[PDB]
């Protein structure tokens, strides 16, 4: 036929069985059968989200026609997926595309058993536009309105709005049949019906756990894609991996690994070494976080809730306010958590909230609204979380934001949602949201409290917690703090912890001297002198960073430039010895290199 | 082919002739592409990375894996074609002539049956004969991409996937995003070692193993608008080109002087006259700053800490508050420090904070947020 | 080719089709001083719409056919390239750039062409507003090397909005400030245009009709500018003679009564100022002659160059000021009540004088 040159006989494909089985969709195919059985507008357009099975409904109608499960006023009518692109292809002269389209419409009147399926019906606007020739839809619009042409369309809900609703005469001539995104229970039945086609292709076996896994894990962990497709994507790609094993089962673990490789979200069943890494999670965060055990335990419990599968699936993995003194490791734990979960601190989404000074810098988080500049960019926060859904999002210096930027982030905490300016909801349900505040210490740090009171050393931490938690309640709306999973007021760094900070900060200096063919030994008397002179009980470890800079580095940097300590072994012994005790501010370090 | 050679280039034939660079590492990413290509419904991976993380290299590494037979036996000896959509549009002055050429390509896929298309810059598929609500190259492929009748690797950046592929949300459905991550420094050194013979033969230099380390480490440190497996290669090639214009070896100092010319950050091996400039640095600042010895020492300790390589890489070089009475050399030491480091007072970035007494002039520092004048 | 987007001003000069310019020959010398440069020989005539900027290069084109130019400007042909005409009729991709390259091809071919791009602010934003190739990015290579001599002409606002904001474009063009004339400069402009009028309109124009066209257009017209709105009054004066021949000063006062709308045309009406103020105010006539008295000094006699035309304290009150505005230049609606009872605070002081930028009440 000439109709075979510009289309695909879709009931001939259903008779040959090269259309996939369409399980469910009884109400949607029956609805198409109603609209095709009309007399005025015989034209259903299947509108739905991309991937919900709009093309599947028609190729399930094609199977219903072949199997005789079709009305008698629709019996033995052959569906033709009209390729509009093949109608255009070759139409270099005036009135070729029109002649081809009128010739296609002749073979629908003469045969009388044709139903066109114009997939991507929005492409019917155009397709004959050469500005010396008329439109493709303008040829069809007389025959669509009077029932003279039975045409199924299929368009996404976006492209129906963008291109069909902006031609209200064409929109009028089609009946919008909603093809909804199926439920998870409907998607499992789709995957059980498609089970044969993916087992036969991949030479695998797909256990019923893997259908339940593919529909549940795709509905939970994917938000840019739709169910009767993102669950098929997990079945198809996991079945492809088991074929690549032999270059036979696909089960629950095989689906979760594909979902893990795709989203980035670890949901897969665990090795023994990765399970025991999560039990040593506190002990491995304490390789970088000296002290701060309340907060190291708190972020470890949030990660272990997620990897046990006990996370509330409508909420983030953890919402934290790291509060307390300045320099005690609030940002540094957010770094150490991101190094634990990923291997670097560049995987930390660090939103520095001091850059947010009025309400309208919240447009940096979720992007500009429609009609305004920078609408093409979806915001700094909503993109970085849409690329990496499993993330640690640090809102550093959260009290320095304007108070109306928390209100953007309220439903990030409770729902795991932040709809950007473009309108895409971003999944925050797998992020660890860490808020960092200095509230209640950006002053109280200074020792002594207005008035009389007992104790100090552990009752100034209870004074710290009461001061911080009251400054949080003063600064934040109570519905923000209601949605935080754990508020951890941090400890001031004790004298014994500043000793262990010296081991941690000389290791940065010694790690740089490895690149200079040097080594840096730091004697244990020199660890104590840095630890005294660096100990402020109310700042902690950032004054120690200054003392290691002033006394080790600034003296060692000239010794390198003098070439007096080139590729050797800088020992750094103390000399006045500061008697090892009492003040040691008459003591001095000496740097000598050997070997 | 005959019709597919006009509209693309055979990438596996380029791998047989060894005209592709060695793609070392990226095993988990090439395997992931082969897992997607071995599907049946949508066997269309799209490589979603950042510019220069090696997205085109993953497919060029795939084309080398096809030639070597390190590919699955459902993907064995499939000729890969980088589809040049500019070559498809070129010509096509008449209606359907673009749609002819794409349907001739797609018919050539089905007759041969051993073709993987590689639409590099897959965002260019969105609109190639007309707009999105008309017959473009995307709307012709979308029936065949959705049913596994066409194996097509795409590769866009993260921005081009947002701005163009997600704005055609039906086409995004047809592709399976394989995220190509930016490599680590340890992985980039392995990339640079594998690419050594290509650049030490084009430049006729000898790039030492330390220069591979000093390219990947220094590009990850000091370059912040580019990505690792390209910005470390930029240091390797331009230092190899530095050496060829001296006509035998690309050392650490050859890499670091190329980064010094490109960033402006002096990280190179200090000459002995420049080393003694930094030990006399206090005395050079006292030619402009009378007195203020504790202040001249402190900014000289910060610059000597930077040029000795003892700077914290997560901190600025120095972070000073010059406090004190008016007219004793607070602004003048900042000007003298910029004269020492650059020979210019105009090299000093004076952010005069008396203009910032408003709460809202913070936007003069970091710009306006999206939706505002001063966002451009 | 180049005749399809503008006329040859040099060929119009030697055919006598151009109005002679009297004065602004220091402006013409400044434009020759730009055009005789080597590297960026592109003047932009900065003015405001009607001061005579086409008239500057109309006088430059007359200076070429008179041979009063440098040797780098002799036998040059000026073309008023309308770049809006290049945009017009251009619906397609590449259709715009084709008829700009046809223009630039005749620059290379002839070599003696000086383009006069009137409305040079249009040069930014002819294809894509610098997002892609516009007419600016096509010209900017040749403008920077002196291989394309181009006289721009734009308003000082439009030079700042479009040409100064493109910092690459502002160095290619050299601002020639064409100021608005004085009234005594406008009269000697219209002396040389008397020959152009009397040949066309079949009129004879007396001496003070120019004086009553230049002083009077400065007095009542502020939207338009001097060496154009005064040409307009002598134009519309013969347009009453086409209804009918010597024009008067009343002939110009007639045609400004058409234009602005006021028929009042000061020593006579200033003396019996009181009677035209009694026509809306009867009763309290002592204050009527009091506010008549001081204004008989300010608008008749001696006046400081920096003072308002009388300042009063009223302690009908506002009905007299409305009748005072009606005598003032001829309109009832010139009275603006500020309602100072609607302001009591210090931050509301910026709600009637203008806001500092950034803040509420900027308009």
């Amino acid at each position: 036929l000439v109709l075979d040159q510009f289309g695909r006989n879709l009931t001939a494909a259903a008779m040959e069985g090269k259309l996939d089985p369409v399980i469910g969709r009884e109400k949607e195919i029956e609805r198409v059968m109603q609209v095709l059985s009309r007399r005025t507008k015989n034209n259903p357009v299947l509108i739905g989200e991309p991937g919900v099975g709009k093309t599947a409904v028609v190729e399930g109608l094609a199977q219903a026609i072949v199997h005789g499960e079709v009305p008698e006023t629709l019996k033995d009518k052959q569906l033709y997926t009209l390729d509009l692109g093949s109608l255009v292809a070759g139409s270099r002269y005036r009135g070729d595309f029109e002649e081809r389209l009128k010739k296609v419409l002749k073979e629908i009147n003469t045969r009388g058993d044709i139903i066109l399926f114009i997939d991507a019906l929005h492409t019917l606007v155009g397709a004959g536009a050469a500005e010396g020739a008329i439109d493709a839809a303008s040829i069809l619009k007389p025959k669509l309105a009077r029932g003279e042409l039975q045409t199924i369309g299929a368009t996404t809900l976006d492209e129906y709005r963008k291109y069909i609703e902006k031609d209200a005469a064409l929109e009028r001539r089609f009946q919008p049949v909603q093809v909804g995104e199926p439920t998870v229970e409907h998607t499992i039945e789709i995957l059980k019906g498609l089970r044969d086609r993916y087992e036969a292709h991949h030479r695998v076996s797909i256990t019923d756990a893997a259908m339940v896994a593919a529909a549940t894990l795709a509905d939970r962990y994917i938000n840019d894609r739709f169910l009767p497709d993102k669950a098929i994507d997990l079945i198809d790609e996991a079945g492809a991996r088991m074929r690549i094993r032999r270059m036979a089962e696909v089960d629950d673990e095989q689906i979760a690994e594909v979902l893990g490789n795709w989203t980035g979200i670890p949901v897969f069943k665990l090795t023994e070494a990765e399970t025991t890494r999560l039990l040593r999670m506190e002990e491995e965060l304490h390789k970088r976080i000296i002290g701060q055990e309340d907060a190291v335990k708190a972020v470890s419990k949030a990660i272990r809730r997620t990897r046990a599968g006990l996370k509330d699936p409508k909420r983030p993995s953890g919402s934290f306010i790291f509060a307390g003194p300045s320099g005690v490791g609030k940002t540094e734990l957010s770094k150490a958590l991101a190094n634990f979960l990923f291997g670097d601190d560049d995987a930390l989404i660090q939103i520095d909230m001091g850059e947010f000074h009025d309400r309208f810098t919240a447009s940096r988080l979720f992007g500009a609204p429609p009609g305004y500049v920078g609408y093409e960019e979806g915001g700094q926060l909503t993109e970085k979380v849409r690329r990496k859904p499993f993330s640690v999002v640090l809102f550093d210096a959260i009290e320095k934001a304007h108070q109306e930027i928390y209100n953007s982030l309220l439903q990030v905490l409770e729902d795991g949602r932040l709809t950007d300016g473009q309108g895409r909801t971003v999944d925050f349900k797998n992020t660890v949201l860490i808020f960092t505040s200095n509230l209640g210490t950006s002053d109280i740090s200074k020792p002594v409290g207005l008035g009389f009171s007992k104790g100090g050393g552990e009752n100034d931490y209870e004074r710290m917690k009461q001061k911080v938690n009251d400054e949080l309640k003063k600064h934040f709306r109570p519905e923000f703090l209601n949605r935080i999973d754990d508020i951890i007021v941090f400890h001031q760094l004790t004298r014994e912890e500043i000793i262990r900070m010296v081991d941690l900060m000389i290791s940065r200096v010694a790690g740089q001297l490895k690149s200079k063919d040097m080594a840096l030994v730091l004697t244990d008397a020199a660890k104590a002198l840095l630890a005294k002179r660096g100990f402020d009980p109310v700042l902690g470890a950032r004054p120690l960073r200054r003392t290691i800079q002033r006394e080790i580095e600034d003296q060692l940097s000239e010794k390198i430039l003098f070439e007096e300590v080139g590729p050797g072994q800088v020992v750094t012994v103390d000399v006045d010895n500061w008697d090892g005790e009492g003040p040691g501010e008459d003591a001095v370090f000496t740097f000598t290199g050997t070997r | 082919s005959l019709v597919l050679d006009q509209f693309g280039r055979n990438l596996t034939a380029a791998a047989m002739e060894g005209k592709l660079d060695p793609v070392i590492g990226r095993e988990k990413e090439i395997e992931r592409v082969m897992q997607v290509l071995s599907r049946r419904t949508k066997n269309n991976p799209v490589l979603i990375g950042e510019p220069g993380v090696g997205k085109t290299a993953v497919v060029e590494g795939l084309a080398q894996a096809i030639v070597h037979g390190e590919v699955p036996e459902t993907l064995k000896d499939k000729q890969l074609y980088t589809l040049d959509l500019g070559s498809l549009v070129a010509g096509s002055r008449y209606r359907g002539d673009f749609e002819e050429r794409l349907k001739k390509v797609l018919k050539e896929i089905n007759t041969r049956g051993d073709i993987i298309l590689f639409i590099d810059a897959l965002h260019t598929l969105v609109g190639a004969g007309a707009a999105e609500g008309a017959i473009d190259a995307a709307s012709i492929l979308k029936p065949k991409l959705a049913r596994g009748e066409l194996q097509t690797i795409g590769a866009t950046t993260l921005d081009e996937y947002r701005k163009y592929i997600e704005k055609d949300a039906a086409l995004e459905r047809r592709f399976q995003p394989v995220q190509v991550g930016e490599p680590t420094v340890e992985h980039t050194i392995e990339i640079l070692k594998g690419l050594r013979d290509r650049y030490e033969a084009h430049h006729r230099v000898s790039i030492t193993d330390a220069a591979m380390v000093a390219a990947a480490t220094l590009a990850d440190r000091y370059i912040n608008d580019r990505f690792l497996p390209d910005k470390a290669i930029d240091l390797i090639d331009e230092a190899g080109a530095r050496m060829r214009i001296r006509r035998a070896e690309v050392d650490d100092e050859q890499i670091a002087e190329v980064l010094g010319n490109w960033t402006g950050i002096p990280v190179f091996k200090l000459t002995e006259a420049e080393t003694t400039r930094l030990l006399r640095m206090e005395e050079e600042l006292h030619k402009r700053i009378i007195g203020q010895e504790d202040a001249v020492k402190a900014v000289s300790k910060a610059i000597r800490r930077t040029r000795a390589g003892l700077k914290d890489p997560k901190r600025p070089s120095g972070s000073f508050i010059f406090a004190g009475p008016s007219g004793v050399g607070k602004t003048e030491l900042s000007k003298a420090l910029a004269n020492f480091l650059f020979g210019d007072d105009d090299a000093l970035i004076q952010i005069d904070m008396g203009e910032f007494h408003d709460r809202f002039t913070a936007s003069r520092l970091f710009g306006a947020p999206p939706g505002y004048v001063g966002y451009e | 080719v180049l005749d399809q987007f503008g006329r040859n001003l040099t060929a119009a000069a030697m055919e006598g089709k151009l109005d002679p310019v009297i004065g602004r020959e220091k402006e013409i010398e400044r434009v020759m001083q730009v055009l005789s440069r080597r590297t960026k020989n592109n003047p932009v005539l900065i003015g405001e719409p009607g001061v005579g900027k086409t008239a500057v290069v109309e006088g430059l084109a007359q200076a070429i056919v008179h041979g009063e130019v440098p040797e780098t400007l002799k036998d040059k042909q000026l073309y008023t390239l309308d770049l809006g005409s290049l945009v017009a009729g251009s619906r397609y991709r590449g259709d715009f750039e084709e008829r700009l390259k046809k223009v630039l091809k005749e620059i290379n071919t002839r070599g003696d062409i000086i383009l006069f791009i009137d409305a040079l602010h249009t040069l930014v934003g002819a294809g894509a507003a610098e997002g892609a190739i516009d007419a600016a990015s096509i010209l900017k290579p040749k403008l920077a090397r002196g291989e394309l001599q181009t006289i721009g002409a734009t308003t000082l606002d439009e030079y700042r909005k479009y040409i100064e904001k493109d910092a690459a474009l502002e160095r290619r063009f050299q601002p020639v400030q064409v100021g608005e004339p004085t009234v005594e400069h406008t009269i000697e402009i219209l002396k040389g245009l008397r020959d152009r009028y009397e040949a066309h309109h079949r009129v004879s124009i007396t001496d003070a009709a120019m004086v009553a066209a230049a002083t009077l257009a400065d007095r009542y017209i502020n939207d338009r500018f001097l060496p154009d709105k005064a040409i307009d009054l002598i134009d519309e004066a013969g347009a009453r003679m086409r209804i009918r021949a010597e024009v008067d000063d009343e002939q110009i006062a007639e045609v400004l009564g058409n234009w602005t709308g006021i028929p009042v045309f000061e020593t006579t009406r200033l003396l019996r100022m009181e009677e035209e103020l009694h026509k809306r105010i009867i009763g309290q006539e002592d204050a009527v002659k009091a506010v008549s008295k001081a204004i008989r000094r300010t608008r008749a006699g001696l006046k400081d160059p920096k003072r308002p035309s009388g300042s009063f304290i009223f302690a009908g009150k506002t009905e007299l000021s409305k009748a005072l505005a009606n005598f003032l230049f001829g309109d009832d609606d010139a009275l603006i009540q500020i309602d100072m009872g609607e302001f009591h605070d210090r931050f509301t002081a910026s709600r009637l004088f203008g806001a500092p930028p950034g803040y509420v009440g900027y308009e």
Binding site: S91, Y372 | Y94, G371, Y372, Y375 | -
Partner: peptide, 23 residues
């Protein structure tokens, strides 16, 4: 104290288009 709202327009995108010959 008050925003400005740049409010980016969209453009018409001056178009290439295929045409139709006839012999």
């Amino acid at each position: 104290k008050v925003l400005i709202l740049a409010c980016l327009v969209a453009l018409a995108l001056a178009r290439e288009l295929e045409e139709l010959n006839v012999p």
